Ligand binder design. Sequence first.
Ligand code: ZN
Ligand code: ZN
Lengths: 86, 413
Amino acid sequence: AGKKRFEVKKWNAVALWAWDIVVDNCAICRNHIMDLCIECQANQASATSEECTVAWGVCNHAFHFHCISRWLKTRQVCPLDNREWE
Amino acid sequence: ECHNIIRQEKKNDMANMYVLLRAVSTGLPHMIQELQNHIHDEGLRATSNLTQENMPTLFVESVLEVHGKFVQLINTVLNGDQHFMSALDKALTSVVNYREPKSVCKAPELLAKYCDNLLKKSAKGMTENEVEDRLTSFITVFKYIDDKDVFQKFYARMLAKRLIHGLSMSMDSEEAMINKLKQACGYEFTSKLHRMYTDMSVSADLNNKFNNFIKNQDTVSFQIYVLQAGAWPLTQAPPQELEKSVQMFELFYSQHFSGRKLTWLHYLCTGEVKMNVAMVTTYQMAVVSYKELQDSTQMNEKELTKTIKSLLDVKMINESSFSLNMNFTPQEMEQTRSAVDEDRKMYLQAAIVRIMKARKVLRHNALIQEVISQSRARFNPSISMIKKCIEVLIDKQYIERSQASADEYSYVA
Ligand SMILES: [Zn+2]
Ligand SMILES: [Zn+2]
């Protein structure tokens, strides 16, 4: 035995988690996906801030449902990618 | 004689003055006003007595000393009453957010540090089973904070570090603190702190499932804390594991939650003591100069160099030769002001949207004292910050302008 072992032992891992975006204040709304959008924040809505209405596209990236609906009602592109919306 | 008498503690003149001033309509408001001035004088004196010392425990004790003296005085010689109590609360609210000639307000930092000193397992200036009474008393100053936003963020960072590294005294005591802060400042406003607290407990319970998962099959156990990113201030500090099968944890968490993204904060993980403080708890490189341990597998070299320096200079490695040992935040808060700025811009965007829905056209002269009413629950912003909101929302397609001869801000939807 020696003092240089650095043996495999009990360990405490740490991780972040989020809804599926490279978020960086996602462009439809200057808020986290884990927080209310601007409309719901201004109204101080009763919805769960952590999951307000999360939805996912066919590309499996996530969006705020309200924001993507409003965007869809004016333009035909995916908001995060500018490809065809699906 | 009201001014002379309210500033005197002794004898019958106070007593019968309060009786005769209960009688007169103009009497009790003058007593209330003079007592409010007296309280502001005494509180400012008590707080300003601590120049260059700035100890958080003594700061809170100075405020509570003034509060206790005036509560005792009011009950002893005036009466227990809402108006005198309100004068005390208003005056100390005006007092606590400092206005010194050469330094911006440091009270929310000292109050966050007071809470952390209460909750720390070291318990140097405070002790468990007295911390309950201390944090009950802390509510008095908590209601008095103007920038509750700044106090909340500053406490949140040290909460995160304390709970992740296990420095907090009692998990139950941390919950008790967060509940008291919630009822003092708002459950919705303190919800993110509550979520941050909840992550360790829920992940600790989820590790009961992860241990079963690890024992279910071999070739792909350890504790995990998985953290809700929108609330947490900590990052990966853009790191070898003690147990080192973390992708099993990733697979477990993803399969348990099919709808959640995740990434690993290797910089914050910790192991277990002793070989056969006894400190081997961090960054088990397993291997020589400290810099040569940058020969790891594929990993972010920024974190690698940070951990190498940390490993080199704590306890374990006892340039020409090396060997192992034989046996055994003000700048950060000032940095956190940046995140405060981002959060305040978001918050003011929401508040301005509410104001614009309330009235669809306005000017900045009317917006003054309306934004303060709509933001003082959290913070007391500056006019430059309010304009920073408005003069960007004009180009966000939130606000529009057409008038030439006067001011304008018209709602867009
Ligand atoms: Zn967004
Ligand atoms: Zn896409």
